[PDB]
Amino acid sequence: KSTLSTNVLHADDAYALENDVAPPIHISTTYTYPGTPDTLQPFEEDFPYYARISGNNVDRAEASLSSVLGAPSVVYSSGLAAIYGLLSYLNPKHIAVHKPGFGGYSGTIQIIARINRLTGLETSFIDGKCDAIGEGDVIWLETPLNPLGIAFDIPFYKELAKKKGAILVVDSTFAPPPIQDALVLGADYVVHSATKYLAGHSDVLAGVTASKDRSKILDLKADRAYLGTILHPQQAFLLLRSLRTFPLRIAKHSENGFLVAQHLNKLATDEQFATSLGIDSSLILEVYHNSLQTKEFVAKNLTGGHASCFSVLLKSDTVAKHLCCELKYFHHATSLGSVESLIEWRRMTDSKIDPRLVRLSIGIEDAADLIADLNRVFASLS
Amino acid sequence: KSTLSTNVLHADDAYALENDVAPPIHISTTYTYPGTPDTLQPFEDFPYYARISGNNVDRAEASLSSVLGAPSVVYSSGLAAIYGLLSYLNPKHIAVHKPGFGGYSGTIQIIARINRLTGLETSFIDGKCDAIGEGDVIWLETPLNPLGIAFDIPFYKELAKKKGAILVVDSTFAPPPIQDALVLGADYVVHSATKYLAGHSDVLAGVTASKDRSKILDLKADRAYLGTILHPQQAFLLLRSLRTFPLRIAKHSENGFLVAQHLNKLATDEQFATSLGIDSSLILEVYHNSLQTKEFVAKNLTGGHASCFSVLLKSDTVAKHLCCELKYFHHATSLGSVESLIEWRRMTDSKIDPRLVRLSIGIEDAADLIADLNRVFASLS
Ligand SMILES: *Cc1c(COP(=O)(O)O)cnc(C)c1O
Numbered sequence: 001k002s003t004l005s006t007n008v009l010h011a012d013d014a015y016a017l018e019n020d021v022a023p024p025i026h027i028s029t030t031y032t033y034p035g036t037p038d039t040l041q042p043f044e045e046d047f048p049y050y051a052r053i054s055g056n057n058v059d060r061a062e063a064s065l066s067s068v069l070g071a072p073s074v075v076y077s078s079g080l081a082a083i084y085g086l087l088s089y090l091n092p093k094h095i096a097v098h099k100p101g102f103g104g105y106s107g108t109i110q111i112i113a114r115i116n117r118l119t120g121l122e123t124s125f126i127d128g129k130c131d132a133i134g135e136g137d138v139i140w141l142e143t144p145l146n147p148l149g150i151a152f153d154i155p156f157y158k159e160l161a162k163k164k165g166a167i168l169v170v171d172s173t174f175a176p177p178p179i180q181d182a183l184v185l186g187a188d189y190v191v192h193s194a195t196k197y198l199a200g201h202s203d204v205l206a207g208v209t210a211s212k213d214r215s216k217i218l219d220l221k222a223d224r225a226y227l228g229t230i231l232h233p234q235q236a237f238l239l240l241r242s243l244r245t246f247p248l249r250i251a252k253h254s255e256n257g258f259l260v261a262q263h264l265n266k267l268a269t270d271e272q273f274a275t276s277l278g279i280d281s282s283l284i285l286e287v288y289h290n291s292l293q294t295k296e297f298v299a300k301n302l303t304g305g306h307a308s309c310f311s312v313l314l315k316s317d318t319v320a321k322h323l324c325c326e327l328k329y330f331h332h333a334t335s336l337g338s339v340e341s342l343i344e345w346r347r348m349t350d351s352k353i354d355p356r357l358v359r360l361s362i363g364i365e366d367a368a369d370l371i372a373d374l375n376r377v378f379a380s381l382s
Numbered sequence: 383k384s385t386l387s388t389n390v391l392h393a394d395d396a397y398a399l400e401n402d403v404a405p406p407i408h409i410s411t412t413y414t415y416p417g418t419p420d421t422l423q424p425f426e427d428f429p430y431y432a433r434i435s436g437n438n439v440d441r442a443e444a445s446l447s448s449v450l451g452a453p454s455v456v457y458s459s460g461l462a463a464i465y466g467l468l469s470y471l472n473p474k475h476i477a478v479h480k481p482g483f484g485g486y487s488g489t490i491q492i493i494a495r496i497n498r499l500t501g502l503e504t505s506f507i508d509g510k511c512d513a514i515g516e517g518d519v520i521w522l523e524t525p526l527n528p529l530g531i532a533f534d535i536p537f538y539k540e541l542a543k544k545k546g547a548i549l550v551v552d553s554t555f556a557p558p559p560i561q562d563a564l565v566l567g568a569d570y571v572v573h574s575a576t577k578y579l580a581g582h583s584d585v586l587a588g589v590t591a592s593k594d595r596s597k598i599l600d601l602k603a604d605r606a607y608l609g610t611i612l613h614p615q616q617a618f619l620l621l622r623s624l625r626t627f628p629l630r631i632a633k634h635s636e637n638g639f640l641v642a643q644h645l646n647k648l649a650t651d652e653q654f655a656t657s658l659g660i661d662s663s664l665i666l667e668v669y670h671n672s673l674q675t676k677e678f679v680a681k682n683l684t685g686g687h688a689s690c691f692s693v694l695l696k697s698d699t700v701a702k703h704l705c706c707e708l709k710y711f712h713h714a715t716s717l718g719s720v721e722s723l724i725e726w727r728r729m730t731d732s733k734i735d736p737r738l739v740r741l742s743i744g745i746e747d748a749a750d751l752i753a754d755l756n757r758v759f760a761s762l763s
């Protein structure tokens with residue numbers, strides 16, 4: 001009955017151990033045992049007395065996260081910690097991922113290599129078929145895709161996974177609910193880097209996995225106790241603080257992402273519009289964004305908004321470098337999902353990638369200011 | 383040119399000393415002097431000791447000044463800001479809202495501590511302020527804690543100007559863009575940033591601003607010796623909060639309007655109330671700026687509405703049940719939090735009407751808050 005704005009604020013009320021309005025930071029590693037000599041009662045998976053196994057700050061953060069995700073959730077010290085935990089738990093023989101040249105988070109490929117070192121896990125590529133995938137194998141669908149910001153059809157891959165007896169994991173980092181609900185669309189598990197949108201202020205590393213199957217999430221929590229990857233109390237406090245404003249922030253990100261992507265696409269494709277702004281439309285070759293895909297499934301996947309991190313292919317590496325250095329409201333930096341807008345020249349970190357490609361992460365500024373900034377730089381290059 | 387949503391995010395860009403996207407916490411009390419033996423030369427702006435000045439405070443003040451439209455000085459609490467301002471102005475006379483009608487009780491306690499030192503005398507804001515003369519202070523808290531009703535800032539500025547006096551507005555209940563007390567003519571504006579500006583009930587902070595930068599520099603110098611600077615960790619959290627302040631304050635204002643309007647409808651429309659299972663006589667009066675019939679209110683609150691306001695109920699029994707049985711309102715003091723709060727005022731004050739409750743509307747979906755209130759009022763009918 002209550003909606004997201006209310007639930008992020010009150011989902012943890014039942015988990016409060018004290019009268020503090022803001023959650024306390026239960027920073028202690030260890031907690032004294034209750035009980036007297038007579039009542040002292042010998043009894044570790046829900047052991048609440050050691051913070052590397054379980055803790056109140058994590059409990060409250062997971063309550064709020066589960067309200068966002070609509071399912072039992074397990075929170076980790078980073079997105080890659082969540083991914084490593086999930087893939088080591090599932091222990092598939094085969095995994096299908098997006099081909100690395102096309103896109104997909106490089107850290108996921110590095111985790112697959114580290115698991116392959118141990119298990120021989122074999123990689124194939126997502127191709128609409130996934131012939132190599134069988135029973136207990138994993139389809140790892142990252143959508144929207146890092147760095148392009150375009151979407152894939154989750155229900156389609158759920159039907160493939162179902163036919164094959166395989167497991168569909170969606171890395172939904174670029175579109176958390178309410179923009180996309182990967183679990184409702186059929187994903188067996190969903191993973192997010194909460195470092196990005198959910199925390200949102202570039203000051204928390206965190207990962208989260210969710211599933212409608214609570215017993216699997218409990219297994220993951222048990223494993224987390226020994227992989228050593230629980231989110232610590234101080235970070236769980238800041239993550240929970242962020243979640244309080246997540247419904248407001250994510251709505252603004254989505255609106256801004258649509259507006260900025262659409263403006264850039266209009267510049268690239270409408271020579272009269274560009275000229276009206278003092279801009280040579282040839283500076284932008286292509287804009288990638290979910291709103292520019294012509295496929296009907298995209299609006300059935302991203303039911304509640306738009307990606308705010310997406311890429312642009314520019315005319316040259318010169319244009320890309322000027323754009324990354326000269327914007328007033330976009331800092332040249334990696335990561336995404338921050339309150340402030342960011343831009344990244346993808347070639348910085350990757351020698352194989354086309355030096356014309358830049359990735360934008362739209363923050364919660366006034367879109368008219370972001371568009372005026374972009375216009376100023378593009379005009380200076382015309 | 384750029385608007386508030388952009389400015390709270392970028393006003394501190396020029397004060398960044400490093401490439402960190404999120405501000406670092408420069409927690410150190412002390413910082414090494416630059417210089418070699420050949421280049422070493424002797425020198426409110428000493429940057430090498432955090433109790434005088436610091437980078438986290440600089441960045442927080444840059445963002446605050448963007449919100450407030452004027453140079454700002456940040457303190458360890460709202461009362462630290464008020465004590466700093468009143469001890470700097472050192473008036474012989476001050477006019478305040480009558481205790482009993484409203485006004486923050488801590489301000490009265492500060493006046494008592496300053497009176498102990500100077501003999502500062504108190505009179506009451508009454509539309510005339512006869513006792514107030516040159517250099518004296520009109521202390522106008524608007525919207526008023528706990529009622530949530532507004533007073534006419536330009537009227538009191540005209541009164542102060544005629545007398546040679548100083549108009550201070552405590553604008554805690556309505557920060558910009560809801561109200562801009564300085565544009566309306568206040569000589570100084572004070573906020574408890576503990577409330578809306580920080581907004582998550584986990585930062586104590588105060589802020590004073592003025593169009594006159596010399597006064598703010600004097601306040602910063604005094605702050606260095608009164609010992610009331612905001613510390614680095616708190617300045618970090620306040621700046622973090624300020625990034626979402628424009629979204630939060632718009633939601634607070636919309637919700638406060640909706641909830642006050644609903645409770646007023648329940649109190650003044652017996653049919654509606656009965657259609658909800660509710661006895662309209664349970665609510666005597668709702669106090670809110672949107673219910674005031676004077677023309678000046680919308681000229682002061684130009685960009686929104688109060689979200690902390692009071693309701694006079696039929697009995698203290700009704701008040702206590704409301705305070706204890708709401709799902710989305712915690713029974714606690716303070717206001718301006720993301721979560722909705724309610725307070726039975728008789729808890730903090732033995733002289734106030736036991737029928738009065740103060741509501742602080744958070745950033746929930748207002749339809750859930752209204753449904754919660756409806757459920758409790760129906761259960762009392
Ligand atoms: C950033 C990111 C990750 C990794 O998260 P960390 O918190 O950085 O470990 C995983 N997936 C996607 C899509 C990401 O963007």
Ligand SMILES: *Cc1c(COP(=O)(O)O)cnc(C)c1O
Nearest residue numbers: 459460461486527554574576587
């Ligand atoms: C809470 C409050 C203050 C005092 O602020 P602290 O941060 O609590 O010291 C001052 N004025 C008003 C109107 C307040 O509500």
Ligand SMILES: [Mg+2]
Nearest residue numbers: 009010013721
């Ligand atoms: Mg609560």
Ligand SMILES: [Mg+2]
Nearest residue numbers: 340391392395
């Ligand atoms: Mg910045």
